[PDB]
Ligand binder design. Structure first.
Ligand SMILES: CC(=O)N[C@H]1[C@@H](OP(=O)(O)OP(=O)(O)OC[C@H]2O[C@@H](n3ccc(=O)[nH]c3=O)[C@H](O)[C@@H]2O)O[C@H](C)[C@@H](/N=C/c2c(COP(=O)(O)O)cnc(C)c2O)[C@@H]1O
Ligand SMILES: CC(=O)N[C@H]1[C@@H](OP(=O)(O)OP(=O)(O)OC[C@H]2O[C@@H](n3ccc(=O)[nH]c3=O)[C@H](O)[C@@H]2O)O[C@H](C)[C@@H](/N=C/c2c(COP(=O)(O)O)cnc(C)c2O)[C@@H]1O
Ligand SMILES: C[N+](C)(C)C
Ligand SMILES: C[N+](C)(C)C
Ligand code: NA
Ligand code: NA
Lengths: 395, 395
């Protein structure tokens, strides 16, 4: 197999062992989560961060703080992991699907505007695979129509939009550190970021059974039982062992982004000849007029077949099989039409017509791995498999 | 300070280090959670178990599977941690408080029956401190009124009721492994247990984004993208590092229950002379005719002041102060009237009048530690602090 992702180091194993043997294992008995919060906020260009159990709970707590619920429409992408949509359903709101950009796979200002109604309250925009959304256009639309924006940053650690971290631009950023993500806190983890003090206080309470931050930290208490629960909430906390991994990985992020970026550019460079021959489309953020001064996180590397130009005996799926047969990982990538899941049967939530760009990218995507442990030889194998298979197509 | 709880061993540190370095860190990339589920189910006398992020999410997923929501009343206890009540509020149902037993601190068949209505659908009974509820009475009452029962077992690992593990008697058992609990999976953790296959399938899907167990494991899959999400759900999963701790601690539970029991017996025995003198009430499960062939988990050890028999210069609160001043941990214990929290302001959820037994136990409780790391000498010091302060009261 190729070099693993995730790939935990002895430093990380020693850190979790130390946290465990300290017995200071909980948000309320140690300081690892609290220091991870302040370090993550600084790293993500945000005033506030809160450590969460996972990226789904991060979306959930953001929707809770924004008072999104029954009768509110929230614009969502069809091209993502289901949590980016089901979080909206689970709070009782109505997800409404926008189509995506043919180059980036993200929802766009134009496709969001097309599905806005007088009931739209929110947008959950996903920075898919690490390519940032057009946040100037999305925030302009949100200002015009009085909408709240949640940036789903689960695939986008290290991405920037015109000089600032993703997750710092919308009202709230939601983050995952699940097992194969760019940051990976020991099996699960998440985070929210915000610049709004009131949204921070609301999310902080909600993930801690409705403990008021003001009651805990900003109030003088008599000895004995303390009355802290000033609203209803739940347990969406992270452990100390997950947090110490997060803190370690923040310090690695420049290295990790640089390695992902180098791996991606080697693969995109090799795909260019097959774009010239008409078999691939190879969108590159660094060559985009509209994503000047932005950076791609490179969670995963997408290119797209030009189906019309493949011989009849070839297809996207056959290319995946042939690259896999040469020992190189290759996938169809993200779900592109999550609304086709049976969860949407009889809900009235499925678009009445399939979203054409989302449908096309589901059919055309080829997805490659670029994670930081991949060796020069593994990236060479990747390039050689692409050249081998497309040379077979070309003859 | 007294011996710590929790108190993680080198064996546990080495196990979490091995899980991390394996890179098999997630429910979907390793087998520690799946083996913990089957071992926990067997240990807890249940056909099915599902690993959960925490005991709050265990309650939440049980209420989801039972289709409890808007317009449904659920009987709850006032004498617990808020999650036993706020889980009901958060799913949209109406918590209705029952008073508690003066000896055991648990809701009783009599006090539950007093607050039943035709809209009651469920009971969340807490085995407080490890003393099992009257499950014959509660299940009889649930049968006659067509109610579902959730056992909140967060404080009750090792408790049995007439030969059976707690958590195996109600429709669903909810469990916590939070940091100071009898089992403590490295900062957070939870579990549900059930004997009902359909409730198991529903909870298993809901904690995993609505992945159907049938779609994942009972369906032959074509190559490429698999359509699994047949209903809506969320991410309420446990990590592999938490699960390996759970598996280790299950094997220690005979020893841990025996040590907690021996510690409790020594303290209760010392309290007997002060009960004889009228200063304490010392309920003992092993002496209760109603709790024959049952066993106490001994999460914490409660006795109760007889307020009426204390001299004017004395109080429950002064006894706590004086025992702590001798170097012995002592607490007022569980919240006894959770409905007094400001979360309940303007909800209409407060009982018309304060619940009198619950109010009394909040005023009279003295709670001592009995966790398995406490040495013979620390238990001796506990007895001597009790004897010193009560000898002062007497003389
Ligand atoms: C355990 C784990 O690693 N889960 C990650 C994984 O989810 P998974 O269940 O495989 O979902 P899908 O990618 O829809 O795949 C469905 C099925 O098709 C198969 N498949 C998939 C792709 C493919 O190319 N080929 C294929 O055969 C899969 O093997 C699986 O059998 O892939 C997702 C993209 C990740 N995304 C999470 C996440 C959250 C939620 O964060 P959280 O996981 O709660 O921290 C929030 N927003 C965003 C934009 C997120 O990305 C999940 O964390
Ligand atoms: C981080 C941690 O260890 N939390 C545990 C702790 O909750 P805590 O926030 O302290 O809540 P309370 O006991 O109501 O105390 C409120 C305040 O008064 C203070 N206090 C409390 C008691 C006292 O004697 N003196 C005092 O000064 C506390 O320090 C705090 O400042 O004490 C609770 C009893 C535990 N209960 C858990 C659990 C779940 C929920 O499971 P989960 O915690 O989500 O796994 C579900 N059902 C059940 C029957 C559960 O037991 C919590 O796990
Ligand atoms: C530091 N960062 C803005 C690139 C995340
Ligand atoms: C049933 N028991 C093994 C938990 C005692
Ligand atoms: Na109903
Ligand atoms: Na009823």
């Amino acid at each position: 197999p190729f070099s693993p992702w995730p790939s935990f180091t002895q430093i990380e194993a020693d850190a979790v062992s130390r946290v465990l043997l300290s017995n200071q294992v909980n948000y309320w008995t140690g300081q690892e989560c609290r220091q991870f919060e302040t370090e993550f906020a600084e790293w993500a260009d945000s005033k506030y961060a809160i450590a969460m159990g996972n990226g789904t709970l991060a979306l959930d707590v953001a929707l809770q703080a924004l008072d999104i619920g029954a009768g509110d429409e929230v614009i969502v992408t069809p091209r993502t992991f289901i949590a980016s949509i089901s979080s909206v359903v689970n709070i009782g709101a109505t997800p409404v699907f926008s189509d995506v950009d043919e180059a980036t796979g993200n929802i766009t200002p134009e496709s969001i505007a097309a599905v806005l109604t007088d009931k739209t309250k929110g947008i959950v925009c996903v920075h898919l695979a690490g390519w940032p959304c057009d946040m100037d256009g999305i925030m302009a639309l949100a200002d015009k129509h009085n909408l709240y924006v949640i940036e789903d940053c689960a695939q986008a650690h290290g991405a920037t939009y015109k000089g600032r971290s993703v997750g710092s631009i919308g009202h709230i950023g939601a983050w995952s550190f699940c097992q194969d993500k760019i940051m990976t806190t020991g099996g699960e983890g998440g985070m929210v970021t915000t610049n709004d003090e009131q949204l921070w206080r609301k999310m902080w309470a909600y993930k801690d059974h409705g403990k008021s931050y003001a009651a805990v930290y900003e109030t003088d208490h008599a000895p004995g039982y303390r009355w802290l629960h000033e609203s209803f909430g739940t347990n969406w906390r992270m452990t100390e062992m997950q947090a110490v991994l997060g803190r370690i990985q923040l310090k690695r992020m420049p290295d990790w982004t640089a390695k992902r970026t180098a791996n991606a550019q080697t693969i995109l460079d090799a795909c260019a000849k097959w774009e010239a021959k008409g078999y691939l489309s190879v969108p590159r953020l660094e060559e985009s007029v509209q994503f000047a001064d932005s950076t791609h996180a490179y969670y995963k590397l997408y290119v797209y077949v030009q189906s019309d130009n493949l011989p009849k005996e070839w297809s996207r799926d056959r290319i995946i099989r042939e690259i896999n047969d040469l020992g190189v990982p290759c996938f169809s990538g993200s779900a592109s039409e999550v609304y086709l899941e049976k969860a949407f049967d009889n809900t009235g939530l499925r678009p009445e017509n399939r979203l054409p760009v989302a449908k096309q990218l589901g059919e055309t995507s080829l997805m490659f791995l670029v994670h930081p442990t991949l060796t020069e030889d593994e990236i060479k194998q990747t390039v050689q498999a692409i050249d081998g298979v497309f040379a077979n197509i070309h003859n």
